[PDB]
Structure 1
C-alpha cells in the first residue's frame, strides 16, 4: 500500500512492486501558467496526451566503480517524439516532469543510489588542474542530450559544491535491499513564466552511487539503471519554423 504503485499518463503505464513512496518536489504539483503570471500574449498550444506521456531514455550500466551520471531538462527530450517537435517549432516552453529512475537487483546484491533533482545545475571545470586556466564546459557537457553524461568528481558534483548536501534537494534513494525505483514529480521552476527549451535547462537529474554496488562472484553482474520521464502540463508559445539550437 506504499511499496506497490502505478503511474498512468497518456498511452503509457509504469508499474512497480517495490517503491518507497513518491516525492512531490517542494510540495507543489505541476500546473499550466495562470493569466496573472503570464506575459506572452499569444494563445499557447497544449498538446496534452501526445507530449505528456512517459519516454524511456537509454540505459546505463552500474559498475562497482561508477562515478555517477546526470541529465538536463528539457534537453533530454528536445529531440524525441512530438514533445521534441513542439520544443523545436516554438520559441517558448514550460512544463513539469515525472521522473522515474529504475534499478533492480537481487536480495543478495547491495548498494545505494542517490537520485536527486538540482534546479539550475551549472557545471564547472577543474580550471586546468592548477586553477590558473579559466576554461569552460563544452556544449556536449552542459547539454549531453538524451544519452546523459558521467560525473568526473561526484564528491563536488563537478561544480564545487558538496554531494553530502544534495539531499537538501528533492530526492529519493534507491537502496537495493529496500526499493527498486525512485519517483520525483517536479513542477516548473524559473524566474520567468516561459522559456526557451533549447537555451535553458531548468534543472538536472543526478543519479549517484553513494554506496558502491557489490555482490559475490557468480551473481548477475549486469545491473542496469533506466530513466523514464514524462512531461506534465507542457505548454508552448511563439510558433515559427523548427530550430534545433
Structure 2
C-alpha cells in the first residue's frame, strides 16, 4: 500500500506501484527524424480520465478504440479535428476499485488494428457491415457482444500474445500499459484509421455474497505520449 501522489500539467491522479509494475511492447514511444516517407508539451500531456464503466456479473466485456476515444472530446480532440496527420503513444492505466470480498479477474489487453465483425442478422438479408458507432464507439466505448471470439472470430484464449496485464482483486487492483505508435506509415489520419483497440475482458466473472454492491467500477485513466504534428488547418 504505497502512498499515492501523482500529478502532471493540471491533472492529478492517485495510483500505486507496489505489485504490478509496467508492461510495454518492448519499445517506448518516441519521435521521428526522417523524410516522412508541432510538438505540444504543455496541454495534451494531461491524464484524460474517462467515464467509469460499471461491471455486472453478467457483463460481456468492453473495448475502446484509439484514437477514436478522444476524437470527439477534449483539447486533444481539437488539435485532431484541425489536423489530418497523426502520431502518438499512450499511457493507458486501467484501474478498478473493489473490496477483498469481491473477485473476478480481468484481461486488460491492447489489440492493434482491432478490425471487428458482427453477426449476420436482420430478418433475411445476406450482407451487412458494422455501423460508424461500432467501428468508432468513442469515449463511452462499446460493451461487445461475443467475447469468446472478440467480435472477429478471434479466440481470447490466445490474446496474451499482445500486451496484457491481469487484474485479480485478490492480488492486483492496478493495470498499466504503455503503447507506442504502430503503423505501416509514420503518419495516418486520426479520423479514418482507428489504430489499436483497447479492450477489457472479464474471464473470471465478478462474484460476491449478497449485499455487497453488485457493481464494482473500472476507472480508466490514459495519457498520450510524445505526440507529434506538422501542417495545420484553420479554425471555424
TM-score (norm 2): 0.92
What is the CA deviation profile of residues 90-144 of structure 1, one whole-angstrom value per residue up to 9, with x for unaligned ones?
Answer: 1111000000111021111110010000000001121239997231100000000
Q: Distance in 1 between matches of 2:193 and 2:178?
A: 20
* Structure 1 segment 1-245 matched on structure 2, within 5 A: 8-17=7-16, 19-24=19-24, 26-35=25-34, 38-39=36-37, 45-128=38-121, 133-241=126-234
Q: CA 1:58–1:164 in structure 2 vs 1: closer, same or farther (change >3 Å)? A: same
- CA drift of 1:78 comes to 1.2
Q: CA 1:21–1:6 in structure 2 vs 1: closer, same or farther (change >3 Å)? A: farther
- CA drift of 1:32 comes to 1.4
Work out whether residues 51 and 81 of structure 1, in 8 Å CA contact, stay in contact via their aligned partners in 2: no
- CA drift of 1:220 comes to 2.4
Alignment root-mean-square deviation, CA: 2.2
SS at match of 2:153: coil
Work out whether residues 4 and 19 of structure 1, in 8 Å CA contact, stay in contact via their aligned partners in 2: no
- CA drift of 1:15 comes to 3.0
- CA drift of 1:6 comes to 6.4
Count matched residues: 235
What is the CA deviation profile of residues 145-178 of structure 1, one whole-angstrom value per residue up to 9, with x for unaligned ones?
Answer: 1110011000000001101111110010111111
Q: Which runs of 5+ in 2 are unaligned?
A: none
Q: Distance in 1 between matches of 2:122 and 2:150?
A: 16
Q: Distance in 1 between matches of 2:149 and 2:124?
A: 16
Q: Distance in 1 between matches of 2:54 and 2:234?
A: 38
Which of the pair is proportionally richer in strand? Answer: 1
Q: Distance in 1 between matches of 2:106 and 2:124?
A: 31
TM-score (norm 1): 0.89
- CA drift of 1:89 comes to 0.7
Q: CA 1:153–1:76 in structure 2 vs 1: closer, same or farther (change >3 Å)? A: same
Work out whether residues 88 and 242 of structure 1, in 8 Å CA contact, stay in contact via their aligned partners in 2: no
Q: Which runs of 5+ in 1 are unaligned?
A: 40-44
What is the CA deviation profile of residues 36-65 of structure 1, one whole-angstrom value per residue up to 9, with x for unaligned ones?
Answer: 5x24xxxxx111131122101111111000
